[PDB]
Amino acid sequence: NKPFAQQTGRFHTIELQEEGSPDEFQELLRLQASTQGHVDETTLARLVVQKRATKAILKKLLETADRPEEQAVWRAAIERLVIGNTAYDLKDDESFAKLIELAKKHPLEKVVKNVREVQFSEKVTLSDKYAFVPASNQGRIFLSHLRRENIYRTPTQRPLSLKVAEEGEGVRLKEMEEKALGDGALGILRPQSLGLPEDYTGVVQVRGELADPEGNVYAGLKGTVIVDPRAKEDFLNLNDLYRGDTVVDGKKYTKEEVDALIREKLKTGALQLNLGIHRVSTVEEAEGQYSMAASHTAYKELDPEIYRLLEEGVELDAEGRPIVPIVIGKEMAAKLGLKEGDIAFTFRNALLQARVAAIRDRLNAVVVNQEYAKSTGVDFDGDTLVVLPKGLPVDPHRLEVFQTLMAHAGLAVEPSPGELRFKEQLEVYDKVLARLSKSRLAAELRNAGVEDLSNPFEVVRQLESLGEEELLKAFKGYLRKGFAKELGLDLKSEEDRARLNQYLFEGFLDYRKQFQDPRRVYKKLPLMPSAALAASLLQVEAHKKEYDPSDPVALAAGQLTTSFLGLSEKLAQDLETSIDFPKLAEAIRAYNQAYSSGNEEQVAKARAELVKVLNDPTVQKFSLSNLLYQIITDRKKRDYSLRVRTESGKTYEYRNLYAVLNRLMQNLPVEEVADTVYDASGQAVEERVPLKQSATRSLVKGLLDLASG
Ligand SMILES: [Mg+2]
């Protein structure tokens, strides 16, 4: 309903961009359009962030001359302020008295357009939309500025207060593997513990903090918990909460250093959990219906059948379209007309075929294995998986297709075949089949309608389909004598005999209910050679770097540079209408075939043809656009950069992605707007960044007082 900075009282909040006012950053962005990309985007963002914040902190410092002891927290949001020639160290009762003095005697905006410097406290956390400051300086808050912005800016409804204790009644804090319950998940608790309607069973997205009475908060959690009355204890996984990696009172408390303070506080029964709900997972329509996604890894404990179902692999169909196992609930299965075994389709709000492996009574999530849906990038912190009925009124794309493009855009890299889930079993079955296909029994089967004896899951299915109970006892009995043979088990020993039926049926034949062909079900999905090829033709990667954790402008300034993600998206849409998906799919399917069991000639010619399609400008720009969309989205957390290795052997690095976005658009060479260039192995040949910055601050000061005489 309202932001978590206000619903808990930790931070006071002020707005950075006022009521519908013009976006002054979008207007500076055509200085880059005029100059053809020789000003710095992140420098322009800083000037905007420093003006909006200086105007907002000030507008509060006067409206709070009447709430004076609430003003003192906004005082320590600016240390020193240079206005004209005088300097205001706000820590002084003297300078701050003078600061509020000229405040009233002079008007707004135009006066702000006349400060020179500004330095912010470590207390203030700047973002693209707000500025946060802790309510009480008494306590201390043990998480970095990015995690404050990640956790406390999200709107949640009224927060709860759950006890944290190891023994007795409360929430326990287990120390498991990181992401053990899934990436975006961070705990399992019951519906009745956070006040949900009786025996709710799904997943809910929360924004909790872990505090003590004295106002200190040691960890903040961002992500989802799994709600289910079937688990015993409300428990939170410590290693999935944001903790440490910040500076309190001059010292840097690492992730491990804060973990000890909690273990000490948790032992003393003086540790709570202030948690707020952001969205409870319903099953709602979209045709199609959708709900949140949960990892199968978080049902290991409770309802293990869901886990074991989705852990035993995925299978590629006859055309190469992977069919992923999901687990849905009663409401969704009804509205989408699906029962167990049905094939459907699913996507995150890439499109994959889905195999219903189970249906639950009260579930309202879409439980999937995540390693098999990495092609649709499902992160379990509130991503909604849509499911569609069995009608299949569309062409689902083939594994080689999107895994290759995803690789040509550096979002995946070597050609590796998969891991056959039934490798050892099918070997043993093929040795028996050499003898079975010769036997009279094989003729009995082919006379009853079962002519292809190569698929064990089909012969057993096609037999119990059309009666023939006796021709199934003989088949199940022949494979017993054959496998006991082939594995050296004595069919008489009643424990050795119990090992046959434990390997042949339980471990193999019983899985005919989930999979069609055991020869096409994998445990680790392969990497098609066209994808390994496609990733060596475009040498594009997304380089990771953290925003300056000491300067609060760096994050907010970085988040402003995200306000043109839409132009990155239109470029992708406007580009994919050109690429002939028919020719690309056949060009890929040809190379993967000629690679696997092709002659020495075609592995060369199929390579040279696919290479010329991927060195094509329309294709290269579409994949490069797809990369920029991910980089821009990620820059809302870190100072990510683009890196490209060209035919010169050099590698170029970019942090002016709008200029890059312009150069791709009008089909211009993109190397001039770059920020730094490297010499293959050697590095830092041109450092263009310092020049673009001071010229930006110069061309700014020019454009300003020139429009004002
Ligand atoms: Mg997500």
Author numbering: 327 to 612, 680 to 742, 750 to 812, 821 to 1117
Authors' account:
For structural analysis of gp96 vRNAP, the shortest gp96 fragment possessing the RNAP activity was delineated using a fast cell-free assay system. The shortest fragment of gp96 that retained RNAP activity encompassed residues 327–1124. We crystallized the 1–1200 and 327–1124 fragments and determined their structures at 3.1 Å and 4.4 Å resolution, respectively. The structure of the 1–1200 fragment was largely the same as the structure of the 327–1124 fragment because most of the flanking regions not essential for the activity were disordered, except for two helices at the C-terminus (1125–1162). By contrast, the virion RNAP adopts a unique flat structure without a clamp. In contrast, gp96 vRNAP contains no defined domain at the corresponding position, resulting in a clamp-less, flat structure that heretofore has not been observed for any RNAP. We hypothesize that this unique structure enables the passage of gp96 vRNAP through the narrow channel in the phage tail. Gp96 is exceptional as it lacks the C-terminal region, and its connector element, which is disordered in the gp96 crystals (gp96 613–679), is twice shorter than in QDE-1 and phi14:2. The disordered region is likely positioned close to the RNA-DNA hybrid duplex during transcription elongation and might dynamically interact with the nascent RNA strand, moving similarly to the clamp domains of other RNAPs. We hypothesize that the vRNAP is associated with the pore formed by the TMP in the bacterial cell envelope and transcribes pre-early phage genes concomitantly with the phage genome translocation through the pore.
Many bacterial and eukaryotic viruses with double-stranded DNA genomes in the realms Duplodnaviria and Varidnaviria encode homologs of cellular RNAPs (collectively denoted “two-barrel RNAPs”). The TMP-fused virion RNAP transcribes pre-early phage genes, including a gene that encodes another, non-virion RNAP, that transcribes early and some middle phage genes. Transcription by vRNAP and nvRNAP is directed by dissimilar AT-rich and GC-rich promoters, respectively, and the two phage RNAPs have distinct overall architectures, with the TMP-fused vRNAP being unusually flat and lacking the clamp domain.
